Amino acid sequence: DLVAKLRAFHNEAQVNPERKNLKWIGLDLSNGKPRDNKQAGVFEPTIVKVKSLKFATEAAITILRIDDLIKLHPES
Amino acid sequence: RGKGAYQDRDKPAQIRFSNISAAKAVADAIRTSLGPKGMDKMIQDGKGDVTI
Amino acid sequence: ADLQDKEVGDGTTSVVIIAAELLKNADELVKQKIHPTSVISGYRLACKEAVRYINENLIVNTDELGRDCLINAAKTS
Numbered sequence A: 001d002l003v004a005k006l007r008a009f010h011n012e013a014q015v016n017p018e019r020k021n022l023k024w025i026g027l028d029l030s031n032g033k034p035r036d037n038k039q040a041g042v043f044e045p046t047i048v049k050v051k052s053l054k055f056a057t058e059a060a061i062t063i064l065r066i067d068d069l070i071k072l073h074p075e076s
Numbered sequence B: 001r002g003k004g005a006y007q008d009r010d011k012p013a014q015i016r017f018s019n020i021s022a023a024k025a026v027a028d029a030i031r032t033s034l035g036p037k038g039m040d041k042m043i044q045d046g047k048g049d050v051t052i
Numbered sequence C: 001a002d003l004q005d006k007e008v009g010d011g012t013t014s015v016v017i018i019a020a021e022l023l024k025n026a027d028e029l030v031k032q033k034i035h036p037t038s039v040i041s042g043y044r045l046a047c048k049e050a051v052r053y054i055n056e057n058l059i060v061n062t063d064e065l066g067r068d069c070l071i072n073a074a075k076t077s
Ligand SMILES: Nc1ncnc2c1ncn2[C@@H]1O[C@H](COP(=O)(O)OP(=O)(O)O)[C@@H](O)[C@H]1O
Pocket: A026, A027, A028, A029, A042, A044, C009, C010, C011, C012, C013, C014, C015, C076, C077
């Protein structure tokens, strides 16, 4: 329910030009309701998100390339 | 004429067949990783080293 | 996770969770006979577009907030 409400808020922000300020709405975990996190002071550096996205995508691609595993028995 | 050399030894034929089977098995194993739509192989060494 | 810690210092759990979820959904796509190359291309395009959208829409300049922004970021961390 919370994710559905958050998605509805963000979709309304993206589709309605005069409701663009709704894109700051995040999750308020203490009360379990959507909250404007920009006004609430919940901030993160942009570099964290960008680097996380890039690194996770590259790791996922690296694992996804594998389709065959050969596991040699140890020489010991 | 008719019959030729009997070829009493079948071992050379068995050796040839085994060699061909081994080569064909290797080719079949590495066929999957050919072309733009091929996929990589994970190989883990006996020492635990991993290569993709 | 170690690389994310070394290069940024935050979000070490989030990157692992996101990578695992991406791998799970990509494998679910592959099981539907979608070729892994198409999945990889889509993931790359989606990552580039997501970075562009973040940099163009979801960024807040700290000059409009001042010292309070640093305190808020530290508290969030
Ligand atoms: N006060 C808060 N209200 C809502 N969400 C928050 C708050 N503080 C942090 N978060 C969110 O919790 C998520 C998890 O952060 P956390 O896992 O503690 O950092 P890390 O991933 O470095 O361990 C972050 O993405 C952040 O957006």
